[PDB]
């Protein structure tokens, strides 16, 4: 189980932005119990908002907590360059229990943003001789660091033997992904086409290839 | 002052038993519940268990219930998580964190629990920096590399992509050149995925002149270091 967060969230240094935490009436609707973790990389997550509204001692203003039905929201005043990171909505559950939220990547805007590059290679004649069939999916020179990627065989959605890495950013300030689709050398000779659907601020490329 | 240092974590084999520690150091750690929290790689916070300030009070999540246990030495300042039969998905770094507590204020006065027990505030205060377990049944592999050739399809106009796949591998550092480090702009290698197998495979991209395809050589340069493999593979256009 799992609370419901936006999976990226961004805005210019001094904007004001919010994350949503959806739960149930037996987590964030049941209890004033909602605390928020931030995770900076390379560091230990800290506590920002704890029992919806309250801050500890130390953490600014700008951070607040808010909470309705089912929904619970964290909002970050005048947005700075040090709130960049991971945030994590957690939850008291009825059971004693303790629920997480996906997370939330929340980056500040320090260039404009950029779609990804996409470039799908079909298995090499090498591998295919290996008995083996990787298809790689090279996406590229985006920002902020957050995409979506899925596959098709055919048109089909093909969830077995995918393989995504997490974007890293790539020397020149922007992120880069790939993502695998393993097969056997028959499965890749079986279907008629293969694609490749990446996902960056609600557009889409996609990218197709044949057992040519 | 208040720290959690985790140990105990690296590279298991699957089936096997793990024991990961947390020391505690500048606050009474009896006084405190606390809890075990998961990150699996690229993914998100995921709650396993918490246990009461005297250790009569366990949960575990239904994920990890049958999986893992929960102990703590109140003598030592410690706490514990022992893993019976790892799998191969149990690979993630463990966080140790201490769950808020204290007295009940009412009307300006301090109220304890039975014992000067501490009521908990359901947040977690102070976090360790983790540990990681990684679970694989793989030994020290080499890689194999194939090229992904450059085509129409990687051709941004003027310039192409074109790199190496370096598949099937173990451990970790593997080391991705270019035209023997004349090429360096362009180059992207990419984080390694570990696989259902056990085994880590990682890509390298260069972008290059559309013009220099048919003319200039492409070599990338795989280094496996823990393996004593090293790979050089002409990665040029098909047809
Ligand atoms: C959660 O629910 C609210 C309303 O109840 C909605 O407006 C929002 O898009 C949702 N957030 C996520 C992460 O699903």
């Known amino acids: 189980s799992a609370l419901t967060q936006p999976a990226s969230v961004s805005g210019s240094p001094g904007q004001t932005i919010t994350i949503s935490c959806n739960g149930t009436?037996?987590?964030?609707?049941?209890?004033?119990?909602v605390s928020w973790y931030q995770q900076s990389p390379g560091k230990a997550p800290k506590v920002m908002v704890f029992?919806?509204?309250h801050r500890p001692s130390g953490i600014s203003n700008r951070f607040s907590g808010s909470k309705s039905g089912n929904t619970a929201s964290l909002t970050i005043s005048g947005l700075h360059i040090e709130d960049e990171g991971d945030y994590f909505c957690?939850?008291?559950?009825?059971?004693?229990?303790?629920?997480f939220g996906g997370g939330t990547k929340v980056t500040v805007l320090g260039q404009p943003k950029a779609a990804p590059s996409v470039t799908l290679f079909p298995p090499s004649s090498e591998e295919l001789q290996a008995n083996k069939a990787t298809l790689v999916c090279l996406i590229s020179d985006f920002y902020p660091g957050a995409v979506t990627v899925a596959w098709k065989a055919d048109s089909s959605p093909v969830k077995a033997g995918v393989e995504t890495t997490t974007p890293s950013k790539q020397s020149n300030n922007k992120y880069a992904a790939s993502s695998y689709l393993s097969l056997t050398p028959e499965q890749w000779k079986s279907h008629k086409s293969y694609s490749c659907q990446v996902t960056h601020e609600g557009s889409t490329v996609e990218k197709t290839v044949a057992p040519t | 002052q208040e720290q959690l240092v985790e140990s105990g974590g690296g590279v298991v084999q699957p089936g096997g038993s793990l024991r990961l520690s947390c020391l505690a150091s500048?606050?009474?750690?009896?006084?405190?519940?606390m809890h075990w929290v998961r990150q699996a790689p690229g993914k998100g916070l995921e709650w396993v268990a918490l246990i009461s300030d005297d250790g009569m009070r366990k949960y575990h999540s239904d994920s990890m219930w049958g999986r893992v246990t929960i102990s703590r030495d109140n003598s030592k300042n410690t706490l514990y998580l022992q893993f019976s039969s790892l799998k191969v998905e149990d690979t993630a770094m463990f966080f140790c964190?201490?769950?808020?507590?204290?007295?009940?204020?009412?009307?300006?006065?301090?109220?304890?629990?039975?014992?000067?027990?501490?009521?908990?505030?359901?947040?977690?205060?102070?976090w360790g920096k983790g540990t990681t377990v990684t679970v694989s049944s793989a030994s020290t592999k080499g890689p194999s590399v194939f090229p992904l050739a450059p085509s129409s399809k990687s051709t941004s106009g003027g310039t192409a992509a074109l790199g190496c796949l370096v598949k099937d591998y173990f451990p970790e550092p593997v080391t991705v050149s270019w035209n023997s480090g004349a090429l360096t702009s362009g180059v992207h290698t990419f984080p390694a995925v570990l696989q259902s197998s056990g085994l880590y495979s990682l890509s390298s991209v260069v972008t290059v002149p559309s013009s220099s395809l048919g003319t200039q050589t492409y070599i990338c340069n795989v280094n496996h270091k823990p393996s004593n493999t090293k790979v050089d593979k002409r990665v040029e256009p098909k047809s």
């Open positions: 500048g606050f009474t750690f009896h006084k405190y519940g």
């Open positions: 029992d919806v509204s």
């Open positions: 964190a201490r769950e808020a507590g204290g007295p009940i204020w009412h009307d300006d006065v301090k109220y304890y629990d039975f014992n000067d027990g501490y009521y908990n505030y359901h947040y977690m205060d102070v």
């Open positions: 009436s037996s987590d964030v609707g049941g209890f004033d119990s």
């Open positions: 957690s939850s008291l559950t009825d059971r004693s229990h303790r629920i």
